[PDB]
Design a protein around this nucleic acid. Structure first.
Ligand SMILES: [Mg+2]
Ligand SMILES: [Mg+2]
Ligand SMILES: [Mg+2]
Ligand SMILES: [Mg+2]
Ligand SMILES: [Mg+2]
Lengths: 66, 111, 135, 167, 171, 177, 154, 148, 113
DNA sequence: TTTTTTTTTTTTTTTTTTTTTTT
């Protein structure tokens, strides 16, 4: 979760498909703050896929910053 | 000064849009936070049995005047409603509200 | 307009004055809303005639369908509202026209409605005084 | 222009003057039922009186032609426009206007009429957002329900002694 | 300098009073269209010159666009649009649209020339109108027009030579 | 420098009262287009130089576009347009549009020659016209034109070349520096 | 420095008086380019020399703002080219003029020679036309019909 | 510093006198109808004579390759250059230089020749506008008749 | 002042000799150079061997402010590898440009023929 | 639940030959 980073840091973070009945989408997720480190995310309804994409990439992105 | 760093961790009691706006207006002030729309995309519009089904994405960016910001995503749906305009309206507005809700949560527990 | 820092007295007056909820005189009906001209007047009396600014970031036409001689339109507008200090809120608004035998009139009605709605919904983010206490 | 700060007294005078309504000598009605409106040139005059000939500016951000359609030799045109009005201190309001031509047999005349009408309508709607004094009171139902030239000084010579002596 | 030099109280007041005034029957021309009344563009140029001075105002073309060129029965039908901006010595400005038109000519270049000139002239006329009634804004008032309808050049000192002794002396 | 130097009171007043003048019948040319009247470009340049001085104005070209280059029976038809901007020492300016037309020539380089030069000439003429009656703004008036047509027809004259320049050196200018 | 140095009253008066002159009969060349008509003109180097005397070797400057080839065409093995240029002339104080010059090249069977000629001619023509707006001493007097009719009957 | 140093009256007058002089036969070359010109190093040394080693500068603004054509295994290349010369006072001149390479089967050699020739042609045509001592006289048809 | 007259009176060819000449004529801290534009002309890896063409613009500027810009050029042929070939063309082009830039100052630093 | 009258004629001929060796 973002709680660990928000506690330690204090950081800001910026930001395809498959499509029948199963979904998977790209990420376009970046992170800033010090310099930036970018990552990418995966998914698993389009809303659920996009949201999950954004979760994981941030998680991976924060790790690299660390 | 230094008060917000401790006033963000507290939680009290899903959250309605107006309530998160009202709490936003308090910690930072009416002139302490701003939000913007970065993108909207009508992913699909479908017609079945005279009823329309819509799904829309939205990119919402929230910045504190200090500089820090968090862009997040939101989605909106409108199922089983005749007429397209109402469907698109509901989906777009719900998308923006949801993106705003999820954007603000990244600054701490309080929001 | 863009770097005019607020003074403490006016800052506190604004912060206290925004939270006041709207009395029954303003609200009209079912759904309870606020007319656009009332919102403009409240903004003028709240920040000053030179304390806020609004613009149109972009506007899109979603469709124009003709069915039995009648036109159906939908228009999306992104309306941005700015204060003299540098704060802003952008929000979306929609406009609809149905049953009109003229395409140009339909487009006009839709575009203007979308702009007005975006303006209404963009000001609400500032405080309860302007309409946040309506739902 | 763009960086001129209002004085306190001018601020207060304009704030009080904008807050008031318009008498029955500024409103006209047309059949549509009936609709009450304020003509564009009167709004320009009111803006000049309120802010001065050098107190406000207006610009066309972008226009676009929505459609040109021909039916039985008649052209139907719809034109949009974005108009931005600004004040000396920096404040501004942008609004949309729309123009229409219906039954003209000449395409060029139709485009001309539509574009000019769109610009005028957009300016009228952009000036409204500054107060009741500039037309914001005519769409209020209560006010509408409640409501319901000598040429001796006309300029006859080019030369203007007063301005030139003051120059 | 232009765009950064302010007015003074006296000049500013005089210009307000002058701009508030209307125009007389000798500034007005009529044409069939059942008549229509208007002000010629060169008259407006003169009025602007003597209202703000020869160096008090500046205009520019910010955009011009051809809408269509069409041939029918060997004749060209053209339509052009122009955005004209008028600016004042303090920084104020008014931008309006002009539109030109040409129809019935058998030459394509002549049609484009006429239309593109008419566009800028009309746009300048309409941009100067929003500074006051003196600069043409009063022509749109029906009461003024019906008031005018109820009403009842031998310059031998023309410039003959090329030099300006007084201008050279002052320079 | 240019664009940052202001007029003095006497200078401004003199130029203001001079620009109000209307040109006499010896600046006016005629051509058939019904007869039409005009002022030739080099005369306009001379008038501008007298009014503001050789260092008092400046003109440029902001854009030029060719509308069309067609071919018909081996003969080219060309059309060009220019945006000509004229400026003064204080900072003022005026812009206008000039159009150049060429038709009938078998060569294509010559057609663009003529069109592209005529366009800039016309643009400069019209950009200077909006400074006063003295720089050509009076020709548009019907009253002023019907006055001239009632004046006597002045016969053509011949200039005297006894004062013409015949040596590159300019002793007065050299002494001035 | 160049571009921000002011003329003195005497220099302004002198240059103003000088530029009003009309050039004598030795500066006018001639051609046969009217299909039965003659045309007068002034040579380039002569105009540069006149400018150098009037303003001095450090009183003026010029540049090229843009140049573009309208067309390079081939017909019967021969190249036809047309090039246009915009030339800006400036004075020591800031005044400037800009006009258009056009170069032509019809007949040559080499592509490089045609382009060379067209470009160089266009730039020189532009420099000539820009300097023409400063006065009669720099070629503005040629367009006069009366002035030429006087020379042709000397 | 350069670009902001003014000329004294004596220096300006001396240079003004010099640049009006025409060029003798020891500077004019010829070729086969007949043509005359001045070599690049000649004009460079003349410029160093008038303005001095630290009294002038030049630079390249635009170089564009008009074409690189290959026919019969033989390249034809053309390069156009714009060169700019300025003095210490601030004055400047700019003109177009050209380079032509033909017949060389080696691509790199043709390109090198054209690119290097264009700069020098433009530099010669830029210095010409300062006066007669830097080649401006060569265009004088009467002058050539006198010298020839 | 006297230094100006001295230098003016003082004012193929092997490479480093010209850099030594510039060092003596103007001094170790009297001149500088920089690379402005680089370009590559034609294709590479033809018939095993490579043909590389690189042209460079070099600007030499003195302490007072005088400067000169000239064009170099570089050619690589025979070497059957992209590696260190285009680099060789780059180095050759830069050196040729520097030599041609130092030439325009005077005879002591070039002026062939 | 927003929102619904505007537009008013202009354009006036110009263009006038150059270029040509270097790394
Ligand atoms: Mg013309
Ligand atoms: Mg020519
Ligand atoms: Mg050559
Ligand atoms: Mg309408
Ligand atoms: Mg019209």
């Amino acid at each position: 979760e973002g709680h660990r980073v928000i506690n330690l840091a204090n950081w800001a973070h910026s930001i395809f498909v498959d499509l029948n009945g199963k979904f998977y989408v790209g990420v376009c997720a970046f992170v800033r703050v010090y310099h930036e480190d970018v990552g990418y995310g995966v998914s698993e309804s389009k809303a659920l896929s996009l949201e999950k994409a954004r979760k994981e990439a941030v998680t991976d992105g924060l790790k690299r910053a660390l | 000064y230094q008060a917000i760093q401790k006033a963000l961790r507290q939680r009290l009691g899903y959250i309605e849009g107006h309530r998160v706006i009202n709490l936003a207006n308090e910690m930072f002030g009416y002139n302490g936070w701003a939000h913007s729309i970065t993108q909207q995309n009508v992913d699909f519009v479908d017609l079945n049995n005279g009823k329309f089904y819509v799904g829309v994405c939205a990119f919402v960016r929230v910045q504190l005047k200090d500089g820090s910001y968090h862009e997040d995503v939101g989605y909106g749906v409108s199922e089983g409603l005749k007429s397209k305009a109402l469907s698109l309206e509901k989906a777009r507005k719900e998308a923006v509200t949801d993106g705003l809700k999820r954007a603000l949560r990244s600054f701490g527990n309080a929001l």
